[PDB]
Amino acid sequence: SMEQVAMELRLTELTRLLRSVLDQLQDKDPARIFAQPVSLKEVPDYLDHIKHPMDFATMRKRLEAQGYKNLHEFEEDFDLIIDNCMKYNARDTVFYRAAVRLRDQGGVVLRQARREVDSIG
């Protein structure tokens, strides 16, 4: 149908906007601490601690399959990256600190993204 196509163009445009959001968030991680999944070879107990691992490469895979229906779903995955790190790693660690700085800097980007998603519909 013509409606299914219109819907698909909206999703494609959301994907376009989320791709730009993702790039902006990932620039706030210049050490690349959050770029890839935590290695289960190097942290074999990880899944005993963290039940839903997340990282920017895994978000990008979902993004490119148009697997984010709305900004809420995308934000859920970004918050997993931060929250998983802040639980597994102690406060005095470069990892925890990186997550805090990503959360703080990402807030600004996500605030305007929400306005753009509502605005453009």
Pairwise CA distance, residues 69 & 7, whole Å: 11
Q: What whole-number distance in Å separates Cα of residue 70 and Cα of residue 76?
A: 10
Q: Give the experimental resolution in Å.
A: 1.6
Q: Which of 82, 70, 74 is nearest to 28 (CA)?
A: 82
Determine the Cα–Cα distance for residues 25 and 103; give it in Å rounded to an integer: 9
User: Domains along the chain?
Assistant: 1-121 (1.20.920.10)
Cα 68 to chain centroid, rounded? 11
Evaluate whether 81 touches 56 at the Cβ level (below 8 Å): yes
Tokens of 33: 């601490």
Determination technique used: X-ray
Cα separation, 72 vs 47, whole angstroms: 25
